[PDB]
């Protein structure tokens, strides 16, 4: 199936049971979510974006259910303005950018 | 053809003759480039990203040559850390995100 890019490519995912609407971003290397708690087993991280950078908590082998699949992967939490799934999860989902 | 997302989806584009390497970003609504000059007929703009926001100069109907096509479209210039083509140009290029 495919997303055509006239509207934002947003889907609902479940991160450890929690429903979250995420933007599928090919220019994000990482996926960073807010408003979910995944606990104390994290390594701290800083990721940069357009206007500067943010403090994140990187979690490993989190389970994500999205577009019919359950995959486990790396989620960060931090004060992102919008939740994004970057290429680490999109490669896990077999997504490609076609033309 | 397609980009698989294990490496960043980077291509070379020519913006009014100038060669620039750009990241194709499905989570950018706009395309913002640096290190090119497109002149004085612009409207100023502020776009937000992950860490905050930036001042940009929005140019209309600029000509872009990329992946075998010449299209004219809206380019912004500002202090972006990496040059991005967002969904305004990717829809013009018939790109979709497939899975």
């Amino acid at each position: 199936p495919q997303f055509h890019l006239w509207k934002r490519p947003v889907v609902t995912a479940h991160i450890e049971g929690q429903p979250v609407e995420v933007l599928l971003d090919t220019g994000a290397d990482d996926s960073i979510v807010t408003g979910i708690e995944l606990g104390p087993h994290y390594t701290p991280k800083i990721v940069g974006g357009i206007g500067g950078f943010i403090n994140t908590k990187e979690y490993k082998n989190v389970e994500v259910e999205v577009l019919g699949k359950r995959i486990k992967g790396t989620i960060m939490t931090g004060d992102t303005p919008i939740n994004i799934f970057g290429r680490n999860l999109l490669t896990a989902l077999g997504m490609s950018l076609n033309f | 053809p397609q980009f698989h997302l294990w490496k960043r989806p980077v291509v070379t584009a020519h913006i009014e003759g100038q060669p620039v390497e750009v990241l194709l970003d499905t989570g950018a609504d706009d395309s913002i480039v640096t290190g090119i000059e497109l002149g004085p007929h612009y409207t100023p703009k502020i776009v937000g990203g992950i860490g905050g926001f930036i001042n940009t100069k929005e140019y209309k109907n600029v000509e872009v040559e990329v992946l075998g096509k010449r299209i004219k479209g809206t380019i912004m210039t500002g202090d972006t850390p990496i040059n991005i083509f967002g969904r305004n140009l990717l829809t013009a290029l018939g790109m979709s995100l497939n899975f």
């Binding site: 971003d25 220019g27 994000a28 290397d29 990482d30 960073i32 991280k45 800083i46 990721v47 940069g48 974006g49 357009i50 950078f53 994004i84 970057g86 | 990241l23 970003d25 989570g27 950018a28 990203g49 992950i50 990496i82 991005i84």
Partner: peptide, 4 residues
Amino acid sequence: FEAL
């Protein structure tokens, strides 16, 4: 877009 984001990276480190």
